[PDB]
Amino acid sequence: SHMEHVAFGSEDIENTLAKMDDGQLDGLAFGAIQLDGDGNILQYNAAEGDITGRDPKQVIGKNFFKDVAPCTDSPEFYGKFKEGVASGNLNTMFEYTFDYQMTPTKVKVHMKKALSGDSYWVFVKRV
Numbered sequence: 001s002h003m004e005h006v007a008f009g010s011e012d013i014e015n016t017l018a019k020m021d022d023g024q025l026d027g028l029a030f031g032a033i034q035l036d037g038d039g040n041i042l043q044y045n046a047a048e049g050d051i052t053g054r055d056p057k058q059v060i061g062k063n064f065f066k067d068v069a070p071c072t073d074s075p076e077f078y079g080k081f082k083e084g085v086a087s088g089n090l091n092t093m094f095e096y097t098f099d100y101q102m103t104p105t106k107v108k109v110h111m112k113k114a115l116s117g118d119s120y121w122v123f124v125k126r127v
């Protein structure tokens with residue numbers, strides 16, 4: 001096996017992904033980003049890089065909302081993220097279109113608080 005057998009949207013996804021280093025995150029079928037509470041990128045997997053074109057190694061440390069993903073700097077994406085950061089229970093799923101310096105690509109996004117401190121998952125798959 002060369003993949004992690006975890007489905008997008010699984011109810012306990014934050015528990016299953018707590019064990020995963022960067023290599024294991026690259027075994028997921030869906031894009032996975034981990035952000036801090038300000039939106040800085042802590043982790044970013046291969047599937048996400050294939051969806052978006054960004055280089056998973058280069059995006060670490062950039063700010064998702066200010067730097068790499070201005071199309072998500074909106075109430076419908078960033079607004080939802082920061083509300084869930086504030087409440088401590090982020091868990092929201094919605095479709096969205098990624099269109100900054102790329103062919104517009106419609107995705108399903110699932111944001112969910114991670115078990116580690118100051119850490120929040122953004123999961124992405126195509127629709």
Ligand SMILES: *C(=O)/C=C/c1ccc(O)c(Br)c1
Pocket residue numbers: 033048052054059068069070071072097098099100
């Ligand atoms: C809109 O600006 C979306 C940009 C975007 C979406 C998803 C990822 O992973 C990146 Br780095 C940028």
